[PDB]
C-alpha cells in the first residue's frame, strides 16, 4: 500500500507547540484505572499485550495500538469493567482505533473469531462511543516521533529507520502501567533516546539530546533522563508468555 512520506507542512513547523498544547487537553490519570472495582492493572497489562499482538500480527499502522490503549483507559474511567468482559472491551477499542488511525481496519469477524458474539461486540464498541461521547481521537506518544526528530535536528536520512525502530519500542512500553502515567511527549522522547541507543545508526551519543529535549519539551533534564529509563524498562517487561 502507498505509504505517507514527509510533508514539512506537518513535520517541520510549530507543531510540537500544538501537540503540546493539545497534549494538555486530557488530564493526567492520577492512578491508572482508579475507578475499577473488578479488573486490575495486572489485567490491563495482560490485555494490552494481547492487543499489541493483535496489531503487530495484522500489521496495522503504528498509531493504532497507542490509540486503542488511549481509548480503553479513557473509557475505563467512566464505565466499569469485568474480567468476563475485558476481552470484549479491549477488542472494541482496537476496532474503533483501527477504523480511525489505519487504512486497513480490523474487521469484527477477524476480532471475534479471536476471543463474545460479533454483535455484542458492536454494542460494546457503541457503548464506548457515546460514553466517550464520540470524542475518541487523542494525542499519541507516536505523534511526537518525527516532530521531535525534526526539532532535535536528527538528519532526515535516518528518520525512516528511527521512526520505525522507536515507534516499535514505544508500543510495547505502552503495555506497562507505570508508563500510562506519563505524557505522550515524554514517552516519545524516552523511546527515541532508548532506541537511539541500539547501533548508533549515525546518531550522536544519546547524551547530547537529553539537554535539548529538556529544552524542546520543557522539563527538567532529570525528568527526561528518568522517562528514558522508565520506557526502556516497560519495553523490557514485554512478555508473550503472560497470555
Amino acid at each position: 500500500n502507498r505509504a505517507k512520506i514527509d510533508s514539512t507542512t506537518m513535520k517541520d513547523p510549530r507543531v510540537l507547540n500544538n501537540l503540546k498544547l493539545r497534549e494538555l487537553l486530557l488530564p493526567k490519570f492520577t492512578s491508572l484505572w482508579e475507578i475499577q472495582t473488578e479488573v486490575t492493572v495486572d489485567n490491563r497489562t495482560i490485555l494490552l499485550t494481547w492487543m499489541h499482538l493483535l496489531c503487530e500480527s495484522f500489521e496495522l499502522d503504528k498509531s493504532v495500538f497507542p490509540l486503542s490503549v488511549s481509548i480503553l483507559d479513557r473509557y475505563l474511567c467512566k464505565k466499569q469493567g469485568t474480567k468476563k468482559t475485558l476481552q470484549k472491551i479491549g477488542a472494541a477499542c482496537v476496532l474503533i482505533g483501527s477504523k480511525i488511525r489505519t487504512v486497513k481496519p480490523m474487521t469484527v469477524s477477524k476480532l471475534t473469531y479471536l476471543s463474545f458474539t460479533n454483535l455484542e461486540l458492536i454494542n460494546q464498541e457503541k457503548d464506548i462511543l457515546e460514553a466517550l461521547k464520540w470524542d475518541t481521537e487523542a494525542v499519541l506518544a507516536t505523534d511526537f516521533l518525527i516532530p521531535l526528530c525534526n526539532a532535535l535536528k536528527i538528519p532526515e536520512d535516518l528518520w525512516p529507520q528511527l521512526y520505525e525502530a522507536a515507534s516499535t519500542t514505544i508500543c510495547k512500553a505502552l503495555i506497562q502501567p507505570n508508563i500510562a502515567l506519563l505524557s505522550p511527549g515524554l514517552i516519545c522522547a524516552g523511546g527515541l533516546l532508548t532506541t537511539i541507543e541500539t547501533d548508533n545508526t549515525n546518531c550522536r551519543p544519546w547524551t547530547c539530546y537529553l539537554e535539548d529535549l529538556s529544552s524542546i519539551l520543557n522539563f527538567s533534564t532529570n525528568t527526561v533522563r528518568t522517562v528514558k529509563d522508565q520506557v526502556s524498562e516497560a519495553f523490557s517487561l514485554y512478555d508473550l508468555e503472560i497470555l
Binding site: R2, T136, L145, I146
Partner: protein, 277 residues
Amino acid sequence: DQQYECVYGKVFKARDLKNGGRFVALKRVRVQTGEEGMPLSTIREVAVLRHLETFEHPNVVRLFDVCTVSRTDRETKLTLVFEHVDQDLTTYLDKVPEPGVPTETIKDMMFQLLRGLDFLHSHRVVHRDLKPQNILVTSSGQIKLADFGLARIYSFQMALTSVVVTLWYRAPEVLLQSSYATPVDLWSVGCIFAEMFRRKPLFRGSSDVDQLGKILDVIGLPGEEDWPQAFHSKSAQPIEKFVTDIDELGKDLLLKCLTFNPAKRISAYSALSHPYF
C-alpha cells in the same frame, strides 16, 4: 431525535427544541446492520471535530451532538447534528448575481478557507474532501469547512489508499496513484479558487486518466524532475483563457496552488502570506 424537528443518508436542516428555535443541521448517518458497527467514516469525522473543537476556529464547522438511538425493534439510527449555515460555496454561486462574486468577496473567502486550512494542517489534519459542496457560507460571508468524513491525522509512514477527493478536485498525485499528503488540500483549493472567479469547475473530467489530461491541457506538462511518456507535450495555454476575470496577483496564487509537483505547491500557511491578500 427526541427534541428535534426537521423542516449514506440525507442532510436535513432542523430546529432544536431547547435553543430559541435555533437551527441545528441534521446529518442522519445510516448504519446498515451488516457486521462492522458505526460507519468507519462517521467516526474519523466526529473524532477530528471533537478533538479540535476547543479551539473554536472560525473557519471550521461546529459539531453539536451525535444522537444515536439504539433500537430493539429495527436497526439503530444516527443523528449527527452540526451548526446550521445557509448555503454551501456551491449554492452561493448558482444563485450569485452577475458577474458572480466581487474580486473582494472572492479574495475574502479564499483567505478564510485558506486560513482554516492552514489551521487544520498545523494539527497534522488533512481534510481530504475539499469541494464547493463541502464549504459553507455564513449569511455574513464567512467560510466553514465541512463533511469531515475523509479527513484524518496524517503521520509519517502511514498507509494510504489513493482514493481522495471527488474526481474533479483530485490532485495529480492522487490520480497517478502515487503517494499523497497535505498538498492534496492546496490543489483542491486552486480548483475551488478558479471556480469562484468563474462559477464553473476548472477541471471537469470523466475518468482518472481523463481527469489528469484536462488538468494537463490547462496547467501544461511538467518536466522529468517534477514528475514522480504518456500524456502530451502541449504549451500550457495561459490560464486567463480558463478562468475569466482574474487579478495579476490572484493569477500567481492560483498558479501557486494548481502546480503539478506538490513538493513545490505553496502551503496554506504562506498562501495567506501571499500578495493577493
